[PDB]
Amino acid sequence: MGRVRTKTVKKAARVIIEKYYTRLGNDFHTNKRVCEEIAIIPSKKLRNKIAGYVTHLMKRIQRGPVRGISIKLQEEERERRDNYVPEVSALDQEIIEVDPDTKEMLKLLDFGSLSNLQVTQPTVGM
Amino acid sequence: VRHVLLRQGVLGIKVKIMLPWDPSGKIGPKKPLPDHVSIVEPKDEILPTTPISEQK
Amino acid sequence: TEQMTLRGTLKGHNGWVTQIATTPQFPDMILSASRDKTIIMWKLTRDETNYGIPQRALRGHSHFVSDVVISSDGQFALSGSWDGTLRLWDLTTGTTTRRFVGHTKDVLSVAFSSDNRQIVSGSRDKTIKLWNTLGVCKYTVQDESHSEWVSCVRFSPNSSNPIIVSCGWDKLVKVWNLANCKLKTNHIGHTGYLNTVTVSPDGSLCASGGKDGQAMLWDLNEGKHLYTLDGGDIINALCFSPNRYWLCAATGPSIKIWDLEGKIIVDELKQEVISTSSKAEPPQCTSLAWSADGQTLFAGYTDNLVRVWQVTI
RNA sequence: AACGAGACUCUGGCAUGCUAACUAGUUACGCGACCCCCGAGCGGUCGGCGUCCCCCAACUUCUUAGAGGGACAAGUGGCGU
Ligand SMILES: [Mg+2]
Ligand SMILES: [Mg+2]
Ligand SMILES: [Mg+2]
Ligand SMILES: [Mg+2]
Ligand SMILES: [Mg+2]
């Protein structure tokens, strides 16, 4: 048997999805026609294997993103999550409080407010 | 392949050339190499679309 | 509340069911085309034991059967196939009496004239073709036409002005003027390729759909986008009701029905829970066709079944 | 990035779908002829046997050989970071 697609079958199927993503549905016999229209595959046997990897990749891409294919419609949802996140309109705030040996680090840099104190358990970690 | 006679025996020559896929031409052959899939891609797809309806 | 309930299932096929046809002259007969190179004429014993039995199996084809439509009288069937041919059967014996040849590539759909004098088809060839019932090709619209697969064309049961509607993959709708075969008007929008288009019995609408997920309405003499209904995932095939002001759509796994007065869902027809371990658990619905009654619809799925749904109050 | 592997070329397996055939046929009857009742019948008619003779009959299942179609780990369930 074998059935380990060669790198010339796993590179067509990767370019095709990038260029034509909105045609390539999820069944095999329609993809076998779209692929025959868009590119020039000089054989029937090769055309079918390319169109058969396209379907695998399509089923996988209807989940999370795959690391060889950069499609337009799935960039923008990452671009969003980098532009901002649903969590906060405030900063994670300046109103935060700390403990000793830093009050004296500031006493030589001149701060005077919004802090706390607790002298830690009296020997190094255990 | 060819022969060459020199005053010390014979030499032989072998030459092989690979023709450069002349599409439809006469400089090389048609029908590119089998493992040569090639993808074509057009442009001008502007999606801006509200449902307008032209009339002829 | 007019609400649909699962009446029964039909079974016996061997591939996807892709089209269903019905005709008022015979209420017990139903025609279903499939993905196994054959079409089936059923015999509806409405007993709940099995709502039907396969009466006859028409054969002769080399590939998938994309479209099927019965004559106006209920004695001829016309079917169009991915092998690039149309066959005009004889629903008494079988015996395709006439066949049509010229499309270079897969015929995706066909339609019949209500006076049974003109035949139209569209194909992966990117061309509309009009024929006599003797199988001579009467006209080919290669110019003026879509630039991609002509996925579905329909005849308008209009009073007098003969016009045919077309929907393709270049995400356009095109209305035609018969007797001159020039494009009347276009209809633009529809981000995504188109799967179907269908007109109301009187003819004022074309409920079209496709990859957009939405069903758009259009006008047949005014020429405006009336409104959009938001459908969800994808729209396989659309159909208007015979006796009411309803539109039914086959979304991916389930059916949706809308009342056009106030543009609202009547219901979603689902199917039952299964323990399937996967994405796309549901077999998808492919094409659905109302009865002549208006009291039942059949819909064909991608698991070789045809399911029957009936209205109740 | 290149070669080898693979792709490729021939062949075997499937089409009652297409193209079309006295240098391949089949079915029919136009036949007719032979033979037996071998069965209704009588012996013809109803039938049975024919690589017996025909058709300017109908067709392509069998034969031949061309164009396309078909299979992709594609569907479903497990094991896989
Ligand atoms: Mg082989
Ligand atoms: Mg053979
Ligand atoms: Mg003989
Ligand atoms: Mg072949
Ligand atoms: Mg799996």
Curated annotation (Swiss-Prot), chain A:
It is found in: Cytoplasm; Nucleus, Nucleolus. The modification Phosphoserine is found at residue 113. Ubiquitinated at Lys-103 by RNF14 and RNF25 in response to ribosome collisions (ribosome stalling). The modification N6-succinyllysine is found at residue 19. Its main location: cytoplasm. GO terms for biological process: translation. One of its GO terms (molecular function) is structural constituent of ribosome. There is a cross-link at residue 103 (Glycyl lysine isopeptide (Lys-Gly) (interchain with G-Cter in SUMO1)). Gene3D superfamilies: Ribosomal protein S17e-like (1.10.60.20). It comes from the Eukaryota. The keyword Nucleus applies. GO terms for cellular component: cytosolic ribosome; nucleolus; ribonucleoprotein complex. There is a cross-link at residue 103 (Glycyl lysine isopeptide (Lys-Gly) (interchain with G-Cter in SUMO2)). Keywords: Cytoplasm, Isopeptide bond, Nucleus, Phosphoprotein, Ribonucleoprotein, Ribosomal protein, Ubl conjugation. Component of the small ribosomal subunit. Part of the small subunit (SSU) processome, composed of more than 70 proteins and the RNA chaperone small nucleolar RNA (snoRNA) U3. Belongs to the eukaryotic ribosomal protein eS17 family. Component of the small ribosomal subunit. The ribosome is a large ribonucleoprotein complex responsible for the synthesis of proteins in the cell. Part of the small subunit (SSU) processome, first precursor of the small eukaryotic ribosomal subunit. During the assembly of the SSU processome in the nucleolus, many ribosome biogenesis factors, an RNA chaperone and ribosomal proteins associate with the nascent pre-rRNA and work in concert to generate RNA folding, modifications, rearrangements and cleavage as well as targeted degradation of pre-ribosomal RNA by the RNA exosome. This is Small ribosomal subunit protein eS17. It comes from Oryctolagus cuniculus (Rabbit).
Swiss-Prot record, chain B:
Component of the small ribosomal subunit. The ribosome is a large ribonucleoprotein complex responsible for the synthesis of proteins in the cell. Has endonuclease activity and plays a role in repair of damaged DNA. Cleaves phosphodiester bonds of DNAs containing altered bases with broad specificity and cleaves supercoiled DNA more efficiently than relaxed DNA. Displays high binding affinity for 7,8-dihydro-8-oxoguanine (8-oxoG), a common DNA lesion caused by reactive oxygen species (ROS). Has also been shown to bind with similar affinity to intact and damaged DNA. Component of the 40S small ribosomal subunit. Identified in a IGF2BP1-dependent mRNP granule complex containing untranslated mRNAs. Interacts with HNRPD. Interacts with PRMT1; the interaction methylates RPS3. Interacts with SUMO1; the interaction sumoylates RPS3. Interacts with UBC9. Interacts with CDK1; the interaction phosphorylates RPS3. Interacts with PRKCD; the interaction phosphorylates RPS3. Interacts with PKB/AKT; the interaction phosphorylates RPS3. Belongs to the universal ribosomal protein uS3 family. The gene is RPS3. The modification Phosphothreonine is found at residues 49-50. There is a cross-link at residue 43 (Glycyl lysine isopeptide (Lys-Gly) (interchain with G-Cter in SUMO2)). It comes from the Eukaryota. The chain holds residues 172 to 227 of 243 of the full protein. There is a cross-link at residues 31, 43 (Glycyl lysine isopeptide (Lys-Gly) (interchain with G-Cter in ubiquitin)). Residues 29-56 are annotated as: Disordered. The modification Phosphoserine is found at residues 38, 53. Methylation by PRMT1 is required for import into the nucleolus and for ribosome assembly. Sumoylation by SUMO1 enhances protein stability through increased resistance to proteolysis. It is found in: Cytoplasm; Nucleus; Nucleus, Nucleolus; Mitochondrion inner membrane. This is Small ribosomal subunit protein uS3.
Curated annotation (Swiss-Prot), chain C:
Pfam families: WD40. GO terms for cellular component: dendrite; nucleus; perikaryon; perinuclear region of cytoplasm; phagocytic cup; ribonucleoprotein complex; ribosome. WD repeats lie at residues 12-43, 60-90, 102-132, 145-177, 189-219, 230-259, 280-310. Signal peptide: none annotated. InterPro entries: G-protein_beta_WD-40_rep, RACK1-like, WD40/YVTN_repeat-like_dom_sf, WD40_repeat_CS, WD40_repeat_dom_sf, WD40_rpt. PROSITE patterns: WD_REPEATS_1, WD_REPEATS_2, WD_REPEATS_REGION. Gene3D superfamilies: YVTN repeat-like/Quinoprotein amine dehydrogenase. The modification Phosphoserine is found at residues 275, 277-278. The modification Phosphothreonine is found at residues 5, 9, 95, 276. It is a peripheral membrane protein. The modification Phosphotyrosine is found at residues 51, 227. Keywords: Acetylation, Apoptosis, Biological rhythms, Cell cycle, Cell membrane, Cell projection, Cytoplasm, Developmental protein, Gastrulation, Growth regulation, Host-virus interaction, Membrane, Nucleus, Phosphoprotein, Repeat, Ribonucleoprotein, Ribosomal protein, Translation regulation, WD repeat. The modification N6-acetyllysine is found at residues 129, 182. Phosphorylated on Tyr-227 and/or Tyr-245 by SRC. This is required for binding to SRC. GO terms for biological process: apoptotic process; gastrulation; rhythmic process. It is found in: Cell membrane; Cytoplasm; Cytoplasm, Perinuclear region; Nucleus. One of its GO terms (molecular function) is translation regulator activity. The keyword Ribosomal protein applies. Scaffolding protein involved in the recruitment, assembly and/or regulation of a variety of signaling molecules. Interacts with a wide variety of proteins and plays a role in many cellular processes. Component of the 40S ribosomal subunit involved in translational repression. Involved in the initiation of the ribosome quality control (RQC), a pathway that takes place when a ribosome has stalled during translation, by promoting ubiquitination of a subset of 40S ribosomal subunits. Binds to and stabilizes activated protein kinase C (PKC), increasing PKC-mediated phosphorylation. Belongs to the WD repeat G protein beta family. Ribosomal protein RACK1 subfamily. It comes from Oryctolagus cuniculus.
